[PDB]
């Protein structure tokens, strides 16, 4: 189920993307409830002002001053994070899943677990049909993989694109974050038709929506923050070598090859959420196991 | 399964939690359920006063007046609430999803279910069982030895702990400084005279009395739960949890031969003892040659 | 499950509760939907008056008066209905998830149940495997009786949750009983707000008026009810000695007169059981007596 | 899990019990949505001007409303909801009180046990082990039912409450239902604030309250008769005694006893369901069986 | 299943009462939300100053709703859906009753176990069979001594079928007298004089077009359903079913022995031939002596 | 089940039906959700006023609605979802029909059981279990085509339904084609109330006008498709003797040259059969010469 592929990276961003669609979500759902442009005529002991309009001269003047005086920000903001963070979403789904791959991890991942809790470890640490099955299967799997191209081009294309995702995102929303005010001035040209050719509009949620941007700014930061950390540790040191020190000092084993390219990679990655299947694929990769067994058999 | 690792405190804390969520998100939808701010200009047998203004006319003043002349605490306390309660949720699961640290916990709560069908433990104070019984040696011989490095499941605790507190502090301190100025009657003050024609208006913020009420609600949780906090906080302090001893086993069986094991293996060993106080005795008729040589006396 | 250890007056009060939050979610829902308090000035061939106020005005009297002039229980009665029914929740539920108190329930459980399955009951009250399982079931009894006997961790706490829920009954009665005669339909409001509508005296009177007098003798009526439930089990608990209990009859229908009395924490929770089925009790003495172990042996041999 | 116990009349109850449930809050929903009743000055061609404003006609209104109606008019749909809440609770105060859930738990546990004993064909025609067993868990069966009619008086103590139940329903809905009128006189002392004192007002669910009080009327009457029946049912025979007449004449086992108190009466139900459970019963009841069995064994 | 048990007049029945159910059902949805009456004054260019307000106009509506539409119009619907509601009962009563069910389940599983009988087959050109055979035969015999004891599936379904004849031809009589009385404008002459000052009015009624149409349409519906009945009601009797006779079977088969059954069973059998005129003969398969006659030339 | 025997000209149907039925359900919930005709009062830079109230206005709206507009305007889409059901009703008849579904079953029950046999592929090249199974399938077939092989009600109830449905098609194209320029936007209302309502010259407007002329083209263009194929399958049975099958093709393509030629009713059937997909003729055919008996009853042995 997938389960096996989830780094702290994963996560933390998946939540990250939860929070953002909630946070959309909120503000585009209490975006139909309350939301008016409430305009009155500017006039360019104390009583009351009679501005002799009807009840529909100001509907009329609502919906014009709704679309003459408001900027493209302040009525869209909650379709661009909702757009945005589903974007996000379908970008951190697309390594692991498209075509020509999903079918391999229905059962690596079986065989894998099928590795892992073989009893016969612990004495080859100190069936012969079994084992030659298995070995071959993990000689053309090894084959398979490493006969593979186009598979760092892509990979490598993602976490950019995050990356040019996130630099695009803050630089829009810091630019033009100003222009979500309170109260805006309307100033169309509508003479014959009303009486009245300038006045004075207030936006209902323009404080909300500021405070909704903050707060949609700090998350999209964080965000951004662990996908440049993602790209320090895929850049600043090689994934395409590993390092057999230990295993010549703890068993003797002096002949482990060090694979390279992409294997190496998948290898790099799956040490991070537990540093003991390596163990087990290895115990499948000593040839002095192979020849004990062989012996055994006669 | 994961019950187990639950000390009272954290059902404590989690059925405060859903209590507050409780009371915010029903604060939040009580919101956009009532009217809001009303306001009149001010002139400042019997007749009315006409006022003579239009219906948009009031719409406009009352929401001028609503952010004009509100404290900013009177409009976004369930929000407040509600973003408080969540990262609290998400500060009493960040120490069982973070990987590193997560596997080990699996390793022992598999190792302590294992532990539970042998009856030479009930004897102590066949051969399949046996052989099982050496198997599980070996287990908890590789954890011990797995578990030697990484000493990071006690000082995050106690971290996460102090977070708790802190946050709590300032929850205390500006729900505790800003609850007075959820007013009913406010006085708006806005220059508004080439439009409406009226310089001074009155105002009546609707839920203003309810508002209040949620506000101590939420502030008698938030403190039990800081004493609950704090509390869990002094228990962590008052002795070392680093370092576990089989002390009562020595002084009720006689097998003083059994090893005290510290650091992070002994934290939580010593945290099961809050739930179930047998655990700790078969995991320590589990950790004594004694037994497997017997067993191996027996099998020849 | 959670239910062999629920004496009748423990299921009926459930109920009761369950009915309480149904009146006061009810009431709650009905409050915000309906309209509210309406009010009119007062100057204190037929015609009309012309009080001359415009269409805001009467809203700005209407949210002035409805909590310048209502007695605050009017108000808020709905709410005080759920708190205190989620406290009643949360007071007749604090013995079972409480850790120190709730995995002795759980081993009580699994060894009565095992107990009434197991075949040598009827086979002791009318070769090797049976044996050896019998053996086990007793050594399993003998540790259990062990670890539990001699303790209060079980018995301490359902009396102070059952004189809780009496003292929750007497203040709410109490203060239930006292407030109920403020709801009134028709009240007056003088305020002084002269400048700003013109009037200073009103006439009020309150849309949900006699239904939360009628919701208010409901809830007197189950609350009655409920405590006289908890008054009950109080003068039950404290009227005799629950935790010394005596496997009297088993020994005159039985004749094996060797089955002692146990005491202390176990002997309430055979009580406790006791309330549902006078039959668990008697086949849990199979396991406790030494002439069943003797006889087992001399099967085994 | 309660099938086995449902008579006929018990399965038609249900079926009022819901209906009177959906009338009920079908008639409630109405009466608290639409208007409640509508009000005029009286002045005891050309029209008429009241003068009065858009307010001040909701308080005369609600006023009226409040101090005028008959109380029978005003909550109708919550009596029904009450009396459908009180006959539904009467329907199962007999399987959840503890001193007869086990009692009946026990019973079908043993009727399923018996549902799939092969033992009942090989009796009728002339597992194992376990079918030995059974005799003497069906023999220490009728040890624990002999204590008293427990399971016996607790149904008869609630159908003459379902009775008196709907004797009064009769009784309050037919005296009290000539007090739903269309066209009621107000009179009240508002005289200061509105101007008016005499006022005229139109019920307008008035001529709907009728024709449910009258289907009301209908089912409750049915119910009354069909509690009636059973009520006749439990009393015209002996329910404390049960004869296996027919059982020892159609196999020839003619030692089978009769059995009185609790079997008596629960034997009298269940065969109301399906009469073949008595005879299937009545094979485990005879020293015949058990001593054909011994004889096999040896 | 129990198709076989149902004529062709059954279903024509069931599905006109579907779309009697349909219809009642649409109109009585629509009655719901659409049905409002207007009235304004009588007075016995530029317009009419009535000077009411806007209660007194529905005071008005109300008040003439129910003085001046006949309850007919009012509750067209509900007429509909009860009589359909009762033609479902009416229905299918005698399928579906605690009793005079088993004598049906009984002759299907007869008819079951009868119709793959090969002796005629094999005849005219292996335990199971002689078994079965003599246990088919002494279960038919039983049967047919039961069922010639009354009445109880005979008297049933004519009492039924006359029952809902009357009920038919009360309802179109009713439907039919009243169909006038839908208009579209009446007059209301109610007398409130002293609150409203005018006492002649006149209003319209919003689906009177509507329900003279969905009237049409149902006595139609009704029509036909009626005379399906009565088509099924001469059935009866015309060609009187009280006897069956083997007739057919004699000549064209050579088997010259079969009895007639009469009473209860003659019905019975007339019914189950109308789905498939085959099973008769099927059925007097199991009336021959043959098989006892070769046991005993057997036993010679 | 029943899908077999449903050529294409029988599914292609049933979409155009449901497609029907939708439209008719839109148009009519369209009718009942939105306004509907708005009339003012005709006078045959200043406004006028008319001075009517606000209850005069909705008397007018509702007077003319239905004494000014043509009844098709007002009742489309009942017409629709009437001609819809009846349509339904009509091509899935003669399944539902009692007295000619039997021979259906038993047709359908018999093809399933012959279809699959392993005597069949034995049979097509050039054990007693399958030979009791074959001879009794031998014997069952055999007086099953004295049941069906007589009469001729399967091929009449399908030429009078197609005949129906292309009757009802011709009458909907004629009035439905011929009424349709009657629905405009404009009208002109003439009522009498002058004593009521002053005024009695007004014009009016319908609201769904255009969109109730756009949905009935597509009406008439769906039932038009629907005419084109109905005539297409009456065409079909009116030029082929269906009342006779002849196995030519079969008896060339196998050598078993003892086939007969089945007609009347049975003949339908195989007719119907092969529009699905033309091999259940050849199973069925080989269980129908006296040649596979006498080789079963050979092999028997």
């Not at 999903?102 to 069936?127: M, V, Y």
């Not at 005010?181 to 936006?203: A, E």
Request: aromatic letters at 16%.
């Amino acid at each position: 189920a997938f389960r096996v592929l989830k780094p702290w990276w994963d996560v933390f961003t998946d939540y990250l993307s939860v929070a953002m669609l909630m946070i959309g979500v909120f503000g585009c759902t209490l975006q139909v409830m309350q939301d008016k442009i409430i305009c009155l005529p500017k006039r360019v002991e104390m009583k009351g002002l009679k501005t002799d309009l009807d009840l529909q001269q100001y509907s009329f003047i609502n919906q014009m001053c709704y679309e003459r005086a408001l900027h493209w920000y302040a009525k869209y903001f909650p379709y661009l994070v909702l757009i945005h963070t589903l974007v996000f979403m379908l970008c951190s789904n697309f390594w692991f899943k498209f075509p020509g791959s999903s079918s391999k991890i229905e059962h690596f991942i079986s065989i894998l677990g099928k590795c892992f809790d073989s009893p016969w470890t612990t004495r080859a640490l100190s069936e012969g049909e079994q084992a030659k099955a298995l070995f071959e299967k993990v000689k053309k799997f090894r084959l398979h993989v490493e006969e593979g191209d186009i598979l760092y081009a892509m990979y490598v294309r993602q976490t950019v694109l995050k990356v040019i995702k996130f630099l695009i995102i803050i630089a829009y929303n810091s630019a033009l974050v100003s222009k979500v005010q309170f109260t805006v001035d309307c100033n169309v040209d509508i003479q014959d038709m009303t009486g009245y050719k300038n006045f004075s509009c207030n936006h209902t949620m323009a404080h909300l929506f500021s405070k909704l941007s903050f707060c949609y700014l700090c998350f999209v930061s964080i965000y951004g923050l662990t996908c440049l950390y993602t790209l320090y540790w895929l850049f600043y040191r090689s994934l395409r070598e590993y390092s057999f020190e230990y295993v010549r000092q703890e068993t003797g084993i002096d002949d482990i090859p060090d694979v390279k390219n992409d294997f190496a990679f998948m290898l790099h990655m799956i040490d991070q959420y537990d540093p003991l299947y390596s163990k087990r694929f290895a115990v499948f990769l000593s040839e002095v196991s192979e020849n004990k067994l062989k012996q055994l058999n006669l």
